[PDB]
mmCIF file with all atom_site columns, C-alpha atoms in Angstrom:
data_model
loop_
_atom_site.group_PDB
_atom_site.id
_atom_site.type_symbol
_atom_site.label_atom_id
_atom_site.label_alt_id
_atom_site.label_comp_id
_atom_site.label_asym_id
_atom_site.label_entity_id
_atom_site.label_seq_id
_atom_site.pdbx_PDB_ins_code
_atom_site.Cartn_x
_atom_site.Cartn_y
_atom_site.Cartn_z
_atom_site.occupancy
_atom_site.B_iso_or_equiv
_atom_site.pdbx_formal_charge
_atom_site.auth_seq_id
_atom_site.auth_comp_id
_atom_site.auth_asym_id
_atom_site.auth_atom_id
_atom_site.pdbx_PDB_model_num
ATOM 1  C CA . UNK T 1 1  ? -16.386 1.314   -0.330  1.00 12.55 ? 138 UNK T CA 1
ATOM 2  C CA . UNK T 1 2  ? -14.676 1.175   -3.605  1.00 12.52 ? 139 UNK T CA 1
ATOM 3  C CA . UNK T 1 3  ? -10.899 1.010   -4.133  1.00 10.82 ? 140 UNK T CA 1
ATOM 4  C CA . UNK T 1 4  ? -11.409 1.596   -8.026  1.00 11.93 ? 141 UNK T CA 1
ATOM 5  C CA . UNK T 1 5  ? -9.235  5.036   -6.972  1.00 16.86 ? 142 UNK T CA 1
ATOM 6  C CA . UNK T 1 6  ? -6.760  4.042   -4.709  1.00 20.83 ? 143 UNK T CA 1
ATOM 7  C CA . UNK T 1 7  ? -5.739  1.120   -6.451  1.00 23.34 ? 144 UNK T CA 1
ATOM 8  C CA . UNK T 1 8  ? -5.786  3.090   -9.945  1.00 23.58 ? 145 UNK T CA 1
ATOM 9  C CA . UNK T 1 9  ? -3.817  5.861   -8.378  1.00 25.19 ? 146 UNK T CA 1
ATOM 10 C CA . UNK T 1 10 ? -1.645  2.821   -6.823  1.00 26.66 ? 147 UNK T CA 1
ATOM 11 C CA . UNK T 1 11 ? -1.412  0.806   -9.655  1.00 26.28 ? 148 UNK T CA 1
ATOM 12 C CA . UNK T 1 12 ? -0.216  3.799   -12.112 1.00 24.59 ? 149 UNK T CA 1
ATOM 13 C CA . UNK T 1 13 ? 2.335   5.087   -9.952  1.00 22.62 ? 150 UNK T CA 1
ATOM 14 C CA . UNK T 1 14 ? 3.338   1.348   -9.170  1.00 23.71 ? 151 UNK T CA 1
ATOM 15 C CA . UNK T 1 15 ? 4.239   0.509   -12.831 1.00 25.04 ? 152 UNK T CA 1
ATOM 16 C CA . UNK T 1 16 ? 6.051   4.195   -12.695 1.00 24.51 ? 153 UNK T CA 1
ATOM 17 C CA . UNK T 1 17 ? 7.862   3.024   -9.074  1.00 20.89 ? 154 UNK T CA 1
ATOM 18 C CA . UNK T 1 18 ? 9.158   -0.058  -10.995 1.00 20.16 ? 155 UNK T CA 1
ATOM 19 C CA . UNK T 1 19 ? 10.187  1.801   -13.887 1.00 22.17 ? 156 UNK T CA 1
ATOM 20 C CA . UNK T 1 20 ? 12.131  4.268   -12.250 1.00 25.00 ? 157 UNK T CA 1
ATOM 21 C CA . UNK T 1 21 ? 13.275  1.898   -9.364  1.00 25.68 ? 158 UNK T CA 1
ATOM 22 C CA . UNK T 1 22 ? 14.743  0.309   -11.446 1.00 23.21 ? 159 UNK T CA 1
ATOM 23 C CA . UNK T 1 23 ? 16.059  3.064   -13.802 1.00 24.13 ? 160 UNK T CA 1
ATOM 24 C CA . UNK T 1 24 ? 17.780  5.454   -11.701 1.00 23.47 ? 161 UNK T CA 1
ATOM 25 C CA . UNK T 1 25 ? 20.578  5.633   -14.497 1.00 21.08 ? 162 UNK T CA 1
ATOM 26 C CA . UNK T 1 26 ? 17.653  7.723   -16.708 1.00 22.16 ? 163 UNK T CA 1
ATOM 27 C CA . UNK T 1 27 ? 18.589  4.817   -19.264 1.00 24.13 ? 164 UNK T CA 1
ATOM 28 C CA . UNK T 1 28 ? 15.087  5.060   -20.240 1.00 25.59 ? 165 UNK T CA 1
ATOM 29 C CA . UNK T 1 29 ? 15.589  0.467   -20.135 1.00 23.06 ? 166 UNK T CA 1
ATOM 30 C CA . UNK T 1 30 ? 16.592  -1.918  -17.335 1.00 27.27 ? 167 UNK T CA 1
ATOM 31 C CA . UNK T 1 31 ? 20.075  -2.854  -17.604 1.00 26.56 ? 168 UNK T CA 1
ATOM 32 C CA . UNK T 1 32 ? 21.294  -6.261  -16.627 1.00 25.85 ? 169 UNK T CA 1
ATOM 33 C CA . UNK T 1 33 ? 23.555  -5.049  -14.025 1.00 23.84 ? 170 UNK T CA 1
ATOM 34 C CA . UNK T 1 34 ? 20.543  -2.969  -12.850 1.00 23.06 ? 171 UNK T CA 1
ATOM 35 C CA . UNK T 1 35 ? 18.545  -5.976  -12.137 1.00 20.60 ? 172 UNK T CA 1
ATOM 36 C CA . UNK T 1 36 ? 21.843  -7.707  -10.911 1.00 16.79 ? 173 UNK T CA 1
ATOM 37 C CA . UNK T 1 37 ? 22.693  -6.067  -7.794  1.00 13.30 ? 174 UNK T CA 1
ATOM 38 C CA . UNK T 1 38 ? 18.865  -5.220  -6.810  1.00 16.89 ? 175 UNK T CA 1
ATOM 39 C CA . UNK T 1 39 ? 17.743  -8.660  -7.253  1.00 18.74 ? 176 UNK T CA 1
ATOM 40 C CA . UNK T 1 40 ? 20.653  -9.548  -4.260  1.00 18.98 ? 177 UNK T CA 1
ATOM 41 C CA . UNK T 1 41 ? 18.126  -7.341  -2.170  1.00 19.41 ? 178 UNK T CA 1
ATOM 42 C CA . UNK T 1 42 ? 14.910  -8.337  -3.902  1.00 18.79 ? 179 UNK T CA 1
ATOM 43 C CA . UNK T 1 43 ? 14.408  -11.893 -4.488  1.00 17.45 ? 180 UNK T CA 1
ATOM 44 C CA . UNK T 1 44 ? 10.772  -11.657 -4.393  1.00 18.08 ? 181 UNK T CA 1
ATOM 45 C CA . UNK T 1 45 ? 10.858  -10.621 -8.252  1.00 21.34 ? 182 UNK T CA 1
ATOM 46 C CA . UNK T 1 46 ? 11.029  -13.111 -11.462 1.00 22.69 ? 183 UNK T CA 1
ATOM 47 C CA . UNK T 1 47 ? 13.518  -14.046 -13.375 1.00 24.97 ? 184 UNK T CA 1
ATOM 48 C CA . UNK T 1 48 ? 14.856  -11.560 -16.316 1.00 25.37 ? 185 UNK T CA 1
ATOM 49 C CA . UNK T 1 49 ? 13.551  -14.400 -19.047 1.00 23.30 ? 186 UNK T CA 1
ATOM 50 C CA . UNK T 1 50 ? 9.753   -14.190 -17.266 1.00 24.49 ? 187 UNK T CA 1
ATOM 51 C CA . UNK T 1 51 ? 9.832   -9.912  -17.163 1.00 23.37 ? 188 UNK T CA 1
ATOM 52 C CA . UNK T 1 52 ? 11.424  -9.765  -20.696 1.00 21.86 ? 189 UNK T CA 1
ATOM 53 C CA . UNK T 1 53 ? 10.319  -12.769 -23.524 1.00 18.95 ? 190 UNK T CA 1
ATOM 54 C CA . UNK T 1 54 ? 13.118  -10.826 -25.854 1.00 18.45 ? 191 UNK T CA 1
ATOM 55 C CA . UNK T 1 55 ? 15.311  -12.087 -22.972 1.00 18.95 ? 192 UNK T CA 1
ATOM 56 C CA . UNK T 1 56 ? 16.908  -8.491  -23.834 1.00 19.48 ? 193 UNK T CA 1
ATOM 57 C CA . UNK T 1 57 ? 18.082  -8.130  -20.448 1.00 19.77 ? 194 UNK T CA 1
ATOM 58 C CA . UNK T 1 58 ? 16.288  -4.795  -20.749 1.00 22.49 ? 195 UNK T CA 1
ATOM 59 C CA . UNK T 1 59 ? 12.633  -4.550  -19.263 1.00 21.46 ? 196 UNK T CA 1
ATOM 60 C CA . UNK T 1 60 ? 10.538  -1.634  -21.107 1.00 21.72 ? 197 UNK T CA 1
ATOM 61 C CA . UNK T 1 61 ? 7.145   -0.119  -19.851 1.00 22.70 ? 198 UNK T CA 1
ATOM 62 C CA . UNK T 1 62 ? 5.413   -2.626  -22.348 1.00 24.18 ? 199 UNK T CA 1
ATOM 63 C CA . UNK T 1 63 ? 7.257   -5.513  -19.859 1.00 20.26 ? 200 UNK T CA 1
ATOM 64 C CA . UNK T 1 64 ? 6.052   -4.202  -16.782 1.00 20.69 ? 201 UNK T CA 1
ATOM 65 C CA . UNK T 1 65 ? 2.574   -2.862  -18.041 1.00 21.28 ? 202 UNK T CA 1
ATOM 66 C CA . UNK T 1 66 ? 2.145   -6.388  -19.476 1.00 20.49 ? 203 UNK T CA 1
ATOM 67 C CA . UNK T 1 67 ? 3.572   -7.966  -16.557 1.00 20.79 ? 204 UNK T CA 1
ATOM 68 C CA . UNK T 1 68 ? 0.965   -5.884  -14.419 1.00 21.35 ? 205 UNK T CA 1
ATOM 69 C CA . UNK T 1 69 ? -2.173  -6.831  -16.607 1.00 19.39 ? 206 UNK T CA 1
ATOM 70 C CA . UNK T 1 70 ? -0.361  -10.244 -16.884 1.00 16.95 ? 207 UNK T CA 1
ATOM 71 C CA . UNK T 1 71 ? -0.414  -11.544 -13.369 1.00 15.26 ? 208 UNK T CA 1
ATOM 72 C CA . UNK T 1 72 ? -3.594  -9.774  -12.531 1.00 15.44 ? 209 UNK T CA 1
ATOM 73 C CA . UNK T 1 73 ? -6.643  -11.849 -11.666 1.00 13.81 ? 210 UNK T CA 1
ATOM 74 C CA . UNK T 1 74 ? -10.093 -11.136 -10.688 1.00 8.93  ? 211 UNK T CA 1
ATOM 75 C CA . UNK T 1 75 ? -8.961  -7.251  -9.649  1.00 7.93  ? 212 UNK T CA 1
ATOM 76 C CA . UNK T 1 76 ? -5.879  -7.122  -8.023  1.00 8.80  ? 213 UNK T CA 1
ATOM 77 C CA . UNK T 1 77 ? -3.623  -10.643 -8.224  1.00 9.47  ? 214 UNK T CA 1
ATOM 78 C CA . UNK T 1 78 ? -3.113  -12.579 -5.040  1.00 8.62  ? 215 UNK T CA 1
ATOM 79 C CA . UNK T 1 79 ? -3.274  -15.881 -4.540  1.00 7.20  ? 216 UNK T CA 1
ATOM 80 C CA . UNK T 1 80 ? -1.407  -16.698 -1.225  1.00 6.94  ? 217 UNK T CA 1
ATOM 81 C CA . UNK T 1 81 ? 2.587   -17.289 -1.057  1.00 8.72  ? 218 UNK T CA 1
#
């Protein structure tokens, strides 16, 4: 069986989870306080200079997308930690 669906389904409305996890304020960015208190409940995320090169302190769709298509190897991105 393929997964070319459920992961394309998964992966879409993962980068659009992220987004608006992170962006309940309808900001449209992710503010550093944002990011500040999650991250006390999510430490298995990078740091804000690794999800934003700008070091903006503000993570945009082209972050995440990136960061998506960044850390993705053969066909998901896994390697065991």
């Amino acid at each position: 069986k393929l997964d070319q669906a459920l992961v394309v389904e998964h992966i879409e409305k993962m980068v659009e989870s992220v987004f608006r996890n992170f962006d309940v304020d309808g900001d449209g960015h992710i503010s550093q306080e944002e990011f500040q208190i999650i991250r006390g409940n999510f430490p298995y995320l990078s740091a804000f200079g690794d999800l934003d090169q700008n070091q903006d302190g503000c993570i945009s769709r082209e972050e995440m997308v990136s960061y998506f298509l960044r850390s993705s190897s053969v066909l998901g991105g896994r390697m065991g930690f």
